[PDB]
């Protein structure tokens, strides 16, 4: 971007588990399903932790 990159966040305010792009502002969350699913569970997309699958 260069001279910085203003941007609007997704999350209200504690998004701790989050980043957004500092070209575009796109947000993801720090937390991703893929490590959820390496742990055996799933990701509760509100919060952005792990819960359990399916069971």
């Known amino acids: 971007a260069r ?5 609007g966040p997704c999350s209200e305010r ?3 588990l989050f980043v ?3 070209q575009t502002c ?3 969350c720090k937390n ?3 490590r959820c ?3 055996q569970l799933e ?3 509100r919060t952005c932790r792990c ?5």
Do not use: F, G, V
Not at 51 to 55: A, E, I, S, V
């Open 3 to 7: 001279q910085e990159n203003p941007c």
């Open 14 to 16: 504690r998004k701790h």
């Open 20 to 22: 957004q792009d500092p």
């Open 26 to 28: 796109k947000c993801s």
């Open 32 to 34: 991703t399903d893929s």
């Open 37 to 39: 699913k390496a742990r």
């Open 43 to 45: 990701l509760n997309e």
């Open 51 to 55: 819960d359990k699958p399916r069971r």
